[PDB]
Design a protein around this ligand. Structure first.
Ligand SMILES: [Zn+2]
Ligand SMILES: [Zn+2]
Length: 65
């Protein structure tokens, strides 16, 4: 069986069995947590956020700078 809950991946509304990203309290499957700009892919390890949405540090560095 998985863990106790699994945390729903914001966007999937389904538990995250395995690694899990935690944004503004919103979770995301480590593969569904993408940049709210290019939507290519994203990781809390080095992402950024603006207007309440994720953005790769390179993106934020491109949008915010
Ligand atoms: Zn998901
Ligand atoms: Zn991006």
């Amino acid at each position: 069986y998985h863990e106790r809950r699994g945390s729903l991946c914001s966007g999937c509304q389904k538990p995250i069995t395995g690694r899990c990203i935690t944004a503004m309290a919103k979770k995301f499957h480590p593969e569904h947590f993408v940049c709210a700009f290019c939507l290519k892919q994203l990781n809390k390890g080095t992402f950024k956020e603006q207007n309440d949405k994720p953005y790769c540090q390179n993106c934020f560095l491109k949008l915010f700078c």
